[PDB]
């Protein structure tokens, strides 16, 4: 009783050859990379992308009035932007990116469409990496589309707030799962944002987003995902909230839970950037020694 979250490269290639008029397919490249990788997602799209794809820029689908990173825009802003990419309520949106990991930032966009009330959305398992590995056809050129009518409404159950995370330190009403790399979580490797130092939220559990994916960047099976959660002491029959640096890679936790039957995993959108900025010293658990310490 959920719309499929994953489609395969083979499924996509077939759809490109057999298009479905009543349910049009819109392919979106949502690649986004941290600056230190020295990659230009938009330019890469211009060079190669899945045929007929548009480029979904997650910096044009964020609230720039926030001091935090990658915050959900309001619904009017999202709808304007999704309609400008040619997405209507009839559309089966399929999102990918070109990350080394397979999928990286695309899960965030799958989550956002759902959050804003568009449930016919999936992700291309293995992303562009796998598409290229299969020697499937590619196109070049800047992104474009005719505009379409799109409406959005945010369901707030998709989000948790700082206030919620804070209340939960004592209340322990939900399990917080943090998708950052282990060393950022532990406090021994740097955070990408200048002025943010690493560490973790007290009581949270680290499941780096890479552990949801196979060695070659395909999704693990639901059998293996359930095993992962359980080995990390996360109980899927209890509430679960996903978090990371800025709320982007958190969406792999959300996806993994969705594929294992649990559809209601909210994202703490403010994530570690917000948490660190709004913290008292008791709120920052780290093996690293602060400037103050
Ligand atoms: C997506 C992501 C993944 C991740 O592992 N961590 C973060 S923290 C936000 C951030 O570094 C950041 C976000 C936006 C722009 C920036 C510009 C400079 C440096 C850091 C960031 N974000
Ligand atoms: Na965010
Ligand atoms: Na930093």
Numbering used by the authors: 5 to 297
What do the study's own words say?
Hydrogen sulfide (H2S) plays roles in many physiological processes in mammals, including relaxation of vascular smooth muscles, regulation of inflammation, and inhibition of insulin signaling. More recently, it has been proposed that sulfane sulfurs, i.e., sulfur atoms with oxidation state 0 or −1, existing in the form of polysulfides (H2Sn), glutathione persulfide (GSSH), glutathione trisulfide (GSSSG), cysteine persulfide (CysSSH) and so on, actually mediate some of the reported biological activities previously thought to be regulated by H2S67891011. We determined the crystal structures of the m3MST complexes with 1 and 3 at high resolution. The most remarkable feature is that C248 is persulfurated in both crystal structures.
To our knowledge, this interaction is novel in terms of both the long distance (>3.45 Å) and the orientation of the persulfide bond (almost perpendicular to the aromatic ring of the inhibitors). Direct hydrogen bonding by R188 and S250 and water-mediated hydrogen bonding by E195 and R197 are commonly observed with compounds 1 and 3. In addition, compound 1 forms water-mediated hydrogen bonds with D63 and H74. Both compounds were in van der Waals contact with W36, L38, P39, D73, H74, Y108, R188, P196, R197, G249, S250, V252 and V277. The thiophene ring (compound 1) and naphthalene ring (compound 3) exhibit cation-π interaction with R197 and parallel stacking interaction with the salt bridge between D73 and R19726. Gas-phase calculations indicated that the interaction of S–S− with pyrimidone is strongly exothermic (10.4 kcal/mol; CCSD(T)/aug-cc-pVDZ), which is not inconsistent with the experimental ITC measurements (ΔH = −9.37 and −11.76 kcal/mol for compounds 1 and 3, respectively). We concluded that the interaction is predominantly due to electrostatic attraction between the persulfur anion and the positively charged carbonyl carbon of the pyrimidone structure. Compound 1 showed about 25% inhibition of recombinant CBS and CSE enzymatic activities, while compound 3 was almost inactive towards CBS and CSE. The side chain of R197 of h3MST is positioned inside the active site and forms a hydrogen bond with pyruvate, whereas that of m3MST-inhibitor complexes is directed outside of the active site and forms a hydrogen bond with D73. The arginine residues in the substrate binding site have been reported to be critical residues in determining substrate specificity for 3MST41, and this difference may be due to the binding molecule, i.e., compound 3 and pyruvate.
